[PDB]
Write a protein that binds this ligand. Structure first.
Ligand SMILES: O=C(O)CNC(=O)C(=O)O
Ligand code: NI
Ligand code: NI
Length: 202
């Protein structure tokens, strides 16, 4: 079923701060197309190094190649399909939590190569571009086919929601967690490419 939030799951998200949904699409043919289209974006020089050699601005902080996808004759049709599915989750957030009132979404396609990592951080921030907080909910969809237990690249999610747990970035896995509260980091990658599609709900 495509409804994510029932009595228990909502309580887990509010208490534990995260929620893991495996076999989100459960469509192998589509998963492979999302992988291919995501990989082609990198091959076609459509990504950018997030950490860019200026001081404290290099691959020490984060070493992935990212692209910001603007969302509502296309090369990323199947990626857009996933993003639409993720948009339905946002709709469910608004319908189940009365005062959530989503403002907008922000999407990032990220590719890590061998040896890539992302130091501890939280996704939420406050900048002059908006009066209020940015990024309340984080939704990460992994597309790494045939990931084994030694390839690294796991997401280390620190369970401290006002100890950690290593989440394997296996294909078709959807990770949801509260952006302002859960600290996390990407452990070093021993395989390539590590593909992850994130949609933040503001
Ligand atoms: O890709 C992941 O698993 C984790 N990504 C992030 O934390 C990020 O882009 O801010
Ligand atoms: Ni279901
Ligand atoms: Ni993050």
């Amino acid at each position: 079923s495509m409804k994510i939030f029932n009595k228990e799951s909502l309580n887990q998200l509010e208490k534990k701060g995260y929620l893991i949904i495996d076999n989100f699409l459960n469509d192998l043919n589509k998963i492979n197309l999302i992988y291919d289209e995501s990989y082609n974006q990198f091959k076609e020089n459509k990504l950018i190094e997030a950490g860019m050699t200026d001081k404290w601005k290099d691959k020490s902080i984060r070493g992935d190649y990212i692209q910001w996808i603007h969302r509502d004759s296309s090369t990323i049709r199947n990626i857009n399909y996933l993003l639409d599915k993720l948009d339905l989750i946002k709709n469910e957030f608004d319908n189940v939590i009365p005062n959530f009132n989503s403002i907008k979404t922000q999407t990032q396609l990220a590719v890590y190569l061998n040896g890539g990592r992302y130091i501890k951080h939280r996704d939420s921030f406050y900048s002059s571009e908006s009066l209020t907080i940015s990024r309340r909910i984080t939704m990460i969809y992994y597309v790494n086919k045939d990931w084994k237990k030694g390839d690294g690249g796991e997401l280390r999610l620190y369970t401290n929601n006002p100890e950690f747990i290593d989440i394997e970035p296996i294909a078709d896995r959807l990770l949801i967690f509260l952006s302002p509260f859960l600290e996390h980091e990407v452990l070093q990658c021993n395989f390539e490419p590590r593909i992850a599609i994130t949609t933040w709900i503001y």
